[model samples]
Target: MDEVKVHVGDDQFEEVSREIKKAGWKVEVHKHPSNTSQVTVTKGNKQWTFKDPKQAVEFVQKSLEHHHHHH
Candidate 1:
């Protein structure tokens, strides 16, 4: 898989979480090391951290599609 990067702030956190939750993936948000916010997603053995809600939603959809195809 290619490296994925996201840049989101506090305002977008909940929406990002909701997007992946709809995709049947687990998500979590925590205070980032840089003092911002970050989100993480999990499906099977795949896990990714996202700094943006929009990108996280995009990644979760795409990543799950990719994983589903590979399986």
Candidate 2:
């Protein structure tokens, strides 16, 4: 079980992050203009993901669902 933080719009934080968390990622909201569904994945203090929030989520979900945990 890994953890990642996802920040959506302030109001959308809970709902959006809920989906992210359900997929097994930590969730955090910054309430700023990200220009996209940004994301940051980490373990402790190390970063595993650094860009494309939506893409990152998809990658994680697909890899897991497809049974490839290379991510």
Model 1: which residue pairs collide?
A: 8-51, 8-52
- Best prediction by TM-score: 1
Clashes per model (N, Cα, C within 3 A): 2, 1
Clashing pairs in 2: 4-26
- In candidate 2, position 12 carries an lDDT of 52
lDDT of 2 by residue, 1-71 (tens): 35666655555555556666667655554655544346665544455453445565677566544654344
Give the C-alpha lDDT of model 1.
0.54
Give the per-residue lDDT digits (tens) of candidate 1, residues 1-57.
333333345565456546645655444444333445565555545667765565666
Q: Give the TM-score of candidate 1.
A: 0.47
Assess every candidate by TM-score. Answer: 0.47, 0.45
